Write a protein that binds this ligand. Sequence first.
Ligand SMILES: C=CC1=C(C)/C(=C/c2[nH]c(/C=C3N=C(/C=C4\NC(=O)C(C)=C4C=C)C(C)=C\3CCC(=O)O)c(CCC(=O)O)c2C)NC1=O
Ligand SMILES: *[C@@H]1O[C@H](CO)[C@@H](O[C@@H]2O[C@H](CO)[C@@H](O)[C@H](O)[C@H]2NC(C)=O)[C@H](O)[C@H]1NC(C)=O
Ligand SMILES: *[C@@H]1O[C@H](CO)[C@@H](O)[C@H](O)[C@H]1NC(C)=O
Ligand SMILES: *[C@@H]1O[C@H](CO)[C@@H](O)[C@H](O)[C@H]1NC(C)=O
Ligand SMILES: *[C@@H]1O[C@H](CO)[C@@H](O)[C@H](O)[C@H]1NC(C)=O
Ligand SMILES: *[C@@H]1O[C@H](CO)[C@@H](O)[C@H](O)[C@H]1NC(C)=O
Ligand SMILES: *[C@@H]1O[C@H](CO)[C@@H](O)[C@H](O)[C@H]1NC(C)=O
Lengths: 49, 285, 49
Amino acid sequence: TGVLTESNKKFLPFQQFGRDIADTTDAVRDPQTLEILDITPCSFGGVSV
Amino acid sequence: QCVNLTTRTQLPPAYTNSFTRGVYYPDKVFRSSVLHSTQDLFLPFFSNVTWFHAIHVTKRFDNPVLPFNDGVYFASTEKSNIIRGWIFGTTLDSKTQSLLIVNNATNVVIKVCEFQFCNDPFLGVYYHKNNKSWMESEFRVYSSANNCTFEYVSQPFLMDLEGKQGNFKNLREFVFKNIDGYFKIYSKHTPINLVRDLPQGFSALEPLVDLPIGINITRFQTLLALHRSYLTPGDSSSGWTAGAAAYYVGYLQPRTFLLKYNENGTITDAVDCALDPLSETKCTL
Amino acid sequence: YLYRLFRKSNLKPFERDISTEIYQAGSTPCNGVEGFNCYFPLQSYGFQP
Ligand SMILES: C=CC1=C(C)/C(=C/c2[nH]c(/C=C3N=C(/C=C4\NC(=O)C(C)=C4C=C)C(C)=C\3CCC(=O)O)c(CCC(=O)O)c2C)NC1=O
Ligand SMILES: *[C@@H]1O[C@H](CO)[C@@H](O[C@@H]2O[C@H](CO)[C@@H](O)[C@H](O)[C@H]2NC(C)=O)[C@H](O)[C@H]1NC(C)=O
Ligand SMILES: *[C@@H]1O[C@H](CO)[C@@H](O)[C@H](O)[C@H]1NC(C)=O
Ligand SMILES: *[C@@H]1O[C@H](CO)[C@@H](O)[C@H](O)[C@H]1NC(C)=O
Ligand SMILES: *[C@@H]1O[C@H](CO)[C@@H](O)[C@H](O)[C@H]1NC(C)=O
Ligand SMILES: *[C@@H]1O[C@H](CO)[C@@H](O)[C@H](O)[C@H]1NC(C)=O
Ligand SMILES: *[C@@H]1O[C@H](CO)[C@@H](O)[C@H](O)[C@H]1NC(C)=O
C-alpha cells in the first residue's frame, strides 16, 4: 500500500525491483508500459497536536 | 573426425597477478548509492592466476584439462577470436554427460549431452586465395553425441573471424559456477589496447545465463582455433598455425566482499575482505 | 520406468545422473562387466495393475 508516482531511474534490462538502504522496495517497473514508478508512504511524517 | 596435433613446444606454466579482478553482481536488484556487503564464491584479490596463450612465432598450442574447482574465472585477451568455446564435465569420455559451449561463427550453441570427446578438440579456420577471406572450415570437437538432454542454438550472426595483427583489442571476462544443478555464467565484454597481461583496472561482471543443466562438473577445457592455409605446410596434424591470443584461469574460493554501488546502480569499487589488515579494517568498519 | 539403485555418493540438488557404468560394490574392480560384487545400478520398477 502506498502512493505511486512517476520517477527517473536507469534500470538495467534484467531488473524490475529497486531497493533502498532499508531494503524495502522503492522503485518498480510497470509490467504493461515499461516505465519506472516510485512508491512512497501516505503518512508523510510528523503531525504534532 | 579428430586429428591429434604434433607440432608443439612445452614451456613452464605462465603465472600472473590477478588484482581487483573477478567480481560479479550478486543479484538482480537495483541498488544505488549503497555500500553492500556479501559472501560468496569470489576470486581473491591479488591471486596468482594461471596463464596460457597461443602464439605462432614453437607454435605453443596449450589447452589442457583443468579442474573446475567449484568455480572458474576465465579471461581472454584476443584480436581475432581464436578462443571459441569451452567443455565441462567429469570424465569427458561418453560415460557421463558433458556441457559444450561453442561459437561456430554463425550460432552460439550450448549442449548438455553424452559427448565422446577427442583428445585435443579444436576448430579449423581456413584462408583462401580466390578471395582474401577467412572462414571456418572444420569442427573437430566430438566424435559422437547421444542421450542429448539440453540444447540451445542462438540466432544466426556474421562475425569477423579474420586474423588481425597488432595489439589485443578485446577483453572477454567470464565467471562460471555450478550451484544447485544450475550453471551460472557472468560476462563482461570490454575493449582494451594492452598486449602483455591483465589490464590495470576494475570491471564488475554482469549476469548472463542461468542454465538448468543438472550436471556434476569437476574438469573443463578450452576450445581454441587453428589457422590453416597454403603457408602452413604438412598434413592436418602439422599443416596449421595458431594466431596470437591469450587467456587466464583463476579458481574461485569462498570469501567475503564489500561492494559499492554508484547512483546509477552499477558497481564502482570493491574490497576483498581478509586480504590484508587494511582491507580487513575496511571490511569491519 | 527405472530408478538408480546404487551410487557412490548422494546427488546434489536438481542434479541428473544418467550414467550406466557398473557399480563396483566390492573392493575388486570388475572392469566394466557384471557378475559378483558389482551390479548394474539401474533397476526397473515392476508396476503390475
Ligand atoms: C561462446 C559463448 C559466447 C557467449 C557467452 C557470448 C556472449 C556475448 N557476446 C556479445 C557480443 C559479441 N560477442 C562476439 C564474439 C565472441 N564473444 C565470446 O564470448 C566469444 C568466445 C566470441 C568469439 C569466439 C562479438 C564479435 C560480439 C560483438 C561485439 C564486438 O564485435 O566487439 C555480448 C555482448 C553483447 C551486448 O553488449 O549486448 C555477449 C554477452 N558470445 C559467444 O560466442
Ligand atoms: C562428481 O564427480 C567427481 C569425480 O568423479 C566425484 O568425486 C569422486 O568420487 C569418488 C567416489 O566417491 C572418489 O573416489 C573420488 O575421490 C572423488 N574425486 C574428487 C576429486 O572428489 C564426485 O563424487 C561426484 N559428485 C556427485 C554428487 O556425484
Ligand atoms: C591420438 O588419436 C587417437 C584416435 O584418433 C586417440 O585414441 C589417441 O588417444 C590420441 N593420442 C594422443 C597423444 O593424442
Ligand atoms: C603465486 O604468487 C604468490 C605471491 O606472489 C606466491 O607465493 C606463489 O609462490 C606464486 N605461485 C607459484 C606456483 O609460485
Ligand atoms: C554451425 O554453423 C552452421 C551454419 O550457420 C549452423 O548450421 C550450425 O547450427 C552451427 N553448429 C550447430 C551445432 O548448430
Ligand atoms: C543412452 O544411450 C544408449 C545408446 O545410445 C541407449 O541404449 C540408452 O537407452 C540411452 N539412455 C538414456 C537415458 O537416454
Ligand atoms: C549516470 O547516468 C547519467 C545519464 O546521462 C549520466 O549523465 C551520469 O554520468 C551517470 N553517472 C555515472 C557516475 O556514471
